[PDB]
Write an enzyme that holds these catalytic residues in place. Structure first.
Site, PDB file in Angstrom:
ATOM      1  N   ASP A  20       0.865  -1.172   0.000  1.00 28.52           N
ATOM      2  CA  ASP A  20       0.000   0.000   0.000  1.00 28.52           C
ATOM      3  C   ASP A  20       0.903   1.225   0.000  1.00 28.52           C
ATOM      4  O   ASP A  20       1.894   1.252   0.713  1.00 28.52           O
ATOM      5  CB  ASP A  20      -0.922   0.060   1.222  1.00 28.52           C
ATOM      6  CG  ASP A  20      -2.144  -0.830   1.099  1.00 28.52           C
ATOM      7  OD1 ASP A  20      -2.559  -1.215   0.004  1.00 28.52           O
ATOM      8  OD2 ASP A  20      -2.738  -1.151   2.132  1.00 28.52           O
ATOM      9  N   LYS A  77      -7.594   1.305  -4.748  1.00 26.71           N
ATOM     10  CA  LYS A  77      -8.712   0.792  -3.980  1.00 26.71           C
ATOM     11  C   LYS A  77      -9.963   1.627  -4.204  1.00 26.71           C
ATOM     12  O   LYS A  77      -9.901   2.857  -4.305  1.00 26.71           O
ATOM     13  CB  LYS A  77      -8.361   0.732  -2.493  1.00 26.71           C
ATOM     14  CG  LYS A  77      -7.353  -0.364  -2.200  1.00 26.71           C
ATOM     15  CD  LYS A  77      -7.092  -0.560  -0.724  1.00 26.71           C
ATOM     16  CE  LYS A  77      -6.552  -1.963  -0.497  1.00 26.71           C
ATOM     17  NZ  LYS A  77      -5.284  -1.985   0.248  1.00 26.71           N
ATOM     18  N   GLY A 149      -4.764  -3.180   9.806  1.00 31.11           N
ATOM     19  CA  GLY A 149      -4.128  -2.103  10.547  1.00 31.11           C
ATOM     20  C   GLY A 149      -3.819  -2.354  12.018  1.00 31.11           C
ATOM     21  O   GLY A 149      -3.716  -1.406  12.770  1.00 31.11           O
ATOM     22  N   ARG A 161      -6.187 -20.494   6.998  1.00 33.06           N
ATOM     23  CA  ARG A 161      -6.455 -21.911   7.338  1.00 33.06           C
ATOM     24  C   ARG A 161      -7.886 -22.369   6.979  1.00 33.06           C
ATOM     25  O   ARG A 161      -8.105 -23.540   6.615  1.00 33.06           O
ATOM     26  CB  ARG A 161      -6.171 -22.237   8.799  1.00 33.06           C
ATOM     27  CG  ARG A 161      -4.687 -22.279   9.151  1.00 33.06           C
ATOM     28  CD  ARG A 161      -4.527 -22.860  10.556  1.00 33.06           C
ATOM     29  NE  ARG A 161      -3.143 -23.034  10.972  1.00 33.06           N
ATOM     30  CZ  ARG A 161      -2.322 -23.976  10.515  1.00 33.06           C
ATOM     31  NH1 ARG A 161      -2.711 -24.841   9.576  1.00 33.06           N
ATOM     32  NH2 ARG A 161      -1.092 -24.020  10.974  1.00 33.06           N
ATOM     33  N   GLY A 210      -2.211  -7.671   8.806  1.00 36.41           N
ATOM     34  CA  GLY A 210      -1.367  -7.718   9.979  1.00 36.41           C
ATOM     35  C   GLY A 210       0.040  -8.246   9.757  1.00 36.41           C
ATOM     36  O   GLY A 210       0.751  -8.551  10.728  1.00 36.41           O
ATOM     37  N   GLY A 231      -0.154  -3.595   4.081  1.00 39.09           N
ATOM     38  CA  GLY A 231      -0.785  -2.284   4.174  1.00 39.09           C
ATOM     39  C   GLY A 231      -0.068  -1.288   5.061  1.00 39.09           C
ATOM     40  O   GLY A 231       0.319  -0.224   4.604  1.00 39.09           O
ATOM     41  N   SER A 232       0.096  -1.654   6.332  1.00 35.07           N
ATOM     42  CA  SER A 232       0.579  -0.758   7.399  1.00 35.07           C
ATOM     43  C   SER A 232       2.010  -1.085   7.888  1.00 35.07           C
ATOM     44  O   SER A 232       2.779  -0.177   8.245  1.00 35.07           O
ATOM     45  CB  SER A 232      -0.433  -0.795   8.582  1.00 35.07           C
ATOM     46  OG  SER A 232      -1.788  -0.477   8.160  1.00 35.07           O
TER      47      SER A 232
END
Lengths: 277, 275, 276, 275, 278
Positions: A20, A77, A149, A161, A210, A231-232
């Protein structure tokens, strides 16, 4: 079919990390680290989480800056169901649209009819049923999603899973039981059977949610994902360029602990994130 | 191929299918003008009243009915009892009806009907259920009310539901059809086939509580392709006159003058039960 | 090992039908019709259902009458947990004990320690977890059980699909996820892995409960059982002798519909049964 | 002193105690090999079936049974009915059984059994209850299942419970025994006596649903000291042969060959009731 | 003979010891100085993770290398539950033990690491016998019976030690025939249940962890039957870490000597204050 051409194109992203980015500086850092693509959005998910407010498609000016900044594919996005945000992005000439749950939902009942677009779409999922519904609406790539995030891999692990586990169950299922499986997933029967025959998702499947360390990125790869979104975890860390590169190398070298040690070593401060439990 | 079986069932449009338990009842139906007979152990009104486990009829009884007539012969198998369906297919009948009137053999799964050569009928109460049966390989749908009560109310409910959801679907925003299929728990491609066609992709007959000619004509006026009658004829005072009258009502469903003449002095209709 | 030898003895029954008999007349009928074995008990399951009262091990006199009346294996039933009833049965010299839920439960918390015995045991189950627990206690043969004494095959289909479906799930399962799977089954891990590696139950699996017709019996075989028990469906029916042979034939020729039509043709009344 | 009464009850170890309602049943039991007879109004299976208030037997009937045999004679009193126990003691019988099979006379208190010269039996369902009865002065415990059903299930449950809690207690951290006594609602000193002894401080017999020799031998193999049989013998087809067979099973409880011979052709066991 | 049994033997060597959580090379030194049988590298001590929040993961491999270089006693490090890649990394660094620790943020809610796939031994936590035995079947070579983390309150460690040990004593005189059902009720493998019965103890080394704040606490855990103790917060969240570390080590070694226990407790400085949650 043009759908199968879109599905074909995304195959190039296998082995890669999609990052991102909110500006052209972030885009160039992502390309230099070896990202397979960049994902243009207004704010990173951790910022969206912290600050709140309505999160929407980025200003097209910004997307144009990111696009001219790099030669790898550029993704952007759009809000779930906002087919007009998607029309604008397509017309700008980027390579993929991610119809993304990190932005503010625009339509709680319906997603974008993605088959009406020339360019390929990414969608999020938390389970197989969801994945197959997105694919039938015309998503060409799937992002199996955890928590956005927080820097906490737990939900990504749960959802990877779950999806992979249902595919393995499906693979060996008595054919006569598949009608009821399809009903139970609320997924289209033909796509369920296609999943059964292939023994895998009919499209490229990446992890997201994450991924904060090279170890997290490699874990996703060992659980059977084709690649990862970050992303973060890169731009909320102490050394984004180094960390970006380490994560790229972790995905390339996911079954090599000596390499995983090497790229993880002296990386600086990871995103602190949030433990929700 | 599935379209052959679907095409076969089209031949039954405009007809009445009559449940029969023996060759005497079989001859009564053919002479009365039925488009097919349905072999079963006991009429649904007796299954309801008596209890016990209701299974496939003895093959010898089905063979007798098969001898006794030239019209198509159908027989019933328990839901999910694929071996019962193998036996029925091996006997050489024309259709199998995987029927909820018999005692359920598999609570979670129906028969994989695509593994058979001959066509299947399945029941339904709503569009979603119809489309699931069809995907399993049913070539014909029975839209079902209450078995064995002579009360048309649930038949009217389910027929209005199936047809109403089709009329809704026809004019639906394409973009909303994906969610509509999720909500029906039905295969998306069959939902779109139903949408473009503007009707069920297979023959739809009404069944459950059809007791009088008026009932039968009512089902046709609601848009069905024909009717099943189980109890209504053989739990009545005069089966043979009543059967002909129902056939006539189905054939002349929009002719009030006709419906009067055929309903006029028919003797006792079945007892039935209000619930 | 002693346990593998017991498991081999029960393996010899594959392709067979085990018939419940209450006297020596029935035991002869069962043998003539082609049963792989007979199961001695006081009253057939449908009569235990109708009449009620406590149902125990049959009188050892009755069992001996049956044992000398036939040359095929003889099985008898003991109440769950009634390890002294099992002692007595073994002492009579029969071939298998079925620790059976159709009899009145003697111990609610514990089954018989079947490892302490010489002769092999049959136990019932409704799911994989339960089968594996019974096998760990020493069961050499598993009877996947539906409803007893109703002629309704619905639960037997449910439980056969359950067991078989869990086994198939287990085959492709990520090895790292098997420990939690075994926790959720409340089953011993080694037996779960054994089941995984074999791709089938570690012992013989027969269906039981509501097999009223030849179609029923062959259905159980096509769902993948090794054999069937028939409890009420023969001896609560019009012609037991002929129906018994027809069921033996259905099991022997389960995937041949022409044979199934033939042997199903004109069998007289099946057992009335009850729906629920 | 209490140890004399406890010592007396040891003599009964390895025996069967047979409920009897008259002197004919009394003679049947002694001849059959019972270690004692128990006089009561009606066998528990008849008390269950019939209802009414079940009390102490008429002293004249107890006197008759006392005449008719030389083995120990016990009789039953209602829980908390200390005057019934005075009468039984005044007659000159050998044990009183303060029995839950009779109709409870005091819901909150049992008989203060230490005020009597002769020994008492009391029932229990768990260790805590056993120890409470013992502290009240019971010299013998009956570990009780269901009265009058011929079903051994609750007997097996309660026998496993009493014995299991004793095996747990034996190896328990001493420091945790105070809380264990609180939780059992039992006197701490009796809990420690039970711990050091490694078994119940008084004779423990099984009772409730013992219907066959196998049942009786099962109770002994679980670790009991003998068995009571109330209904199992006199609600059966042949009481005298069945009684001897149960005595033999209790005496030879670990001999399968023996258990076969004595169980072989015993006639009809009691009807019984599944619950 | 077997690979697992050899791992179990390595852990046996730690009997009578105190394992100290350390976050840097200085603390690691303090621990060896004070007589620790091993050090446990982690990012922040449990009390800090509790107070600060945030996701808690495997320490940076650099920090672990610096700790390993600073000492000659065995080096353990912690990985998140289910994070098998963190554990691969830790193994590749060449440390001696991995602790799949519930103090770090859970990575997999349904599954633990398959610890038989590794060369080095693992520690896992537990709060009851069933748990311990499941961790052992997955390949844990050492069990840490865990109370509260980072509170300095010993209460839940006592409960959990009494539960595990209590259930072990229950098994000893238990009728063999009842063991199948006991195994079901514990949700544990039957074979490990019987092995625990045959041994009359846990099949692997058992340590106490959670709220060990004082020498008295440490000796209490030993007197209850533990083989040793972990201390995270108690040492490095206190007034004199170095003297307090030695005292705790002495209390574990001389756990049945009140005179020594008095000597080592005398004038120790501020203990960790911690928190009372009940």
């Amino acid at each position: 079919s043009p759908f199968s051409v879109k599905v074909g194109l995304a195959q190039m992203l296998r082995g890669g990390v999609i990052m991102d980015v909110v500006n052209a500086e972030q885009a160039r850092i992502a390309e230099e680290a070896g990202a397979c693509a960049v994902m243009a959005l207004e704010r990173v998910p951790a910022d969206i989480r912290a600050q709140g407010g309505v999160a929407r498609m980025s200003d097209p000016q910004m997307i144009k800056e990111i696009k001219q900044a790099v030669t790898i594919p550029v993704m952007a996005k759009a809000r779930i169901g906002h087919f007009v945000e998607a029309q604008i992005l397509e017309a700008i000439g980027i390579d993929y649209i991610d119809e993304s749950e990190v932005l503010t939902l625009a339509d709680e009942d319906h997603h974008i009819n993605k088959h009406n677009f020339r360019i390929p779409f990414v969608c999020g999922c938390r389970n197989l049923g969801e994945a197959l519904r997105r694919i039938r609406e015309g998503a060409a790539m799937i992002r199996t999603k955890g928590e956005a995030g927080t820097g906490n891999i737990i939900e990504a692990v749960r959802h990877v899973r779950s999806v992979n586990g249902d595919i393995r169950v499906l693979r060996n299922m008595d054919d006569d039981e598949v009608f009821t499986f399809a009903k139970k997933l609320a997924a289209p029967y033909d796509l369920v059977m296609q999943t059964k025959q292939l023994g895998r998702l009919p499209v490229v499947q990446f992890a997201a949610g994450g991924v904060a360390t090279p170890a997290d990125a490699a874990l996703m790869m060992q659980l059977g994902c084709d690649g990862v979104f970050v992303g973060s975890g890169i731009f909320k860390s102490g050394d984004p360029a180094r960390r970006a590169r380490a994560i790229v190398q972790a995905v390339t070298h996911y079954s090599d602990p000596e390499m995983l040690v090497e790229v993880s070593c002296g990386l600086g401060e990871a995103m602190v994130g949030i433990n929700l439990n």
